[PDB]
């Protein structure tokens, strides 16, 4: 699937251009199609909250916890693999975002310290065991739902929550349990 990887590289390029005080025009990223730029735009709009793809980027927040933008994706993949994800699967997910162990990510910083310490200290995640796995934290259970995280998890690599039968059923049951 070279075109998804192409959109990912274009997204990395647009992120580098956005963080630094550098402009972003179509001809600039042409040499470095419409499906690929639309994919880069969807990735920027969902993972980082960057709307427009000469272009002009407009953001959403990013009392600002920009790195916490990573949280709902993670809570998604954990919910995708039942309710607990292997650390290897988590790192595989972090890779397509461009975040690598011991690497200073452009926005997240070093990802291991952020996801096994910060998000754990904040009760958003749990990181337990010589193999480790990630699970939802109590803050996650309190501040979002299985249905909202399923909506997010489907919005990328999917379309609707109904495409996941068992997951949509579990989110319905979770909504019924919460209403009590």
């Amino acid at each position, epitope marked *: 699937d070279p075109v998804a990887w192409e959109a990912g590289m274009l997204m990395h390029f647009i992120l580098r251009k956005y963080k630094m005080r550098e402009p972003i025009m179509k001809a600039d990223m042409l040499k470095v199609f419409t499906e690929i730029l639309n994919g880069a735009s969807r990735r920027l709009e969902l993972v980082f909250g960057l709307d427009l793809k000469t272009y002009t980027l407009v953001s959403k927040l990013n*009392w600002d916890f920009p790195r916490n933008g990573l949280l709902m994706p993670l809570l998604g993949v954990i919910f995708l693999k039942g309710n607990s994800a292997t650390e290897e699967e988590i790192w595989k997910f972090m890779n397509v975002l461009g975040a690598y162990d011991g690497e200073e990510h452009l926005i997240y910083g070093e990802p291991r310290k952020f996801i096994t310490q910060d998000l754990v200290q904040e009760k958003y995640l749990k990181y337990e065991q010589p193999r480790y796995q990630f699970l939802w934290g109590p803050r996650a259970y*309190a501040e979002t739902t299985k249905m909202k*995280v399923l909506e997010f998890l489907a919005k990328m690599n999917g379309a609707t929550p109904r495409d996941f039968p068992s997951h949509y059923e579990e989110a319905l049951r979770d909504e019924e349990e919460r209403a009590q």
Partner: nanobody
Amino acid sequence: QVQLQESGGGLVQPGGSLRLSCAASGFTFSTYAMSWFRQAPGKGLEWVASINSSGGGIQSYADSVKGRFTISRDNAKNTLYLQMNSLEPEDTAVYYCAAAAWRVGTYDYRGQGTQVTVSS
């Protein structure tokens, strides 16, 4: 339009109790998960507690307060409550009330806060 108004702060002797309230207007209070944060003198913002929407049956607390603070909500009054028992001087801080955003890990609205001072 939207407003979160915290109230109930003041001086309190250690080991005593105090109820903080947060009145919410301009949005559907019952829809948002709510949180209490606090900022101590010369320290950063610290998450205190969180409670879910749609029944409020899921509470979460920091370890510093787990056995002593109690978050609750009245949807009919659009009000959030933080009951603080067995208070300690560490608990001296400005306390803020904040509505959790749909993108979990961020927040849409926050109040102006109320000062809680624990000293004998």
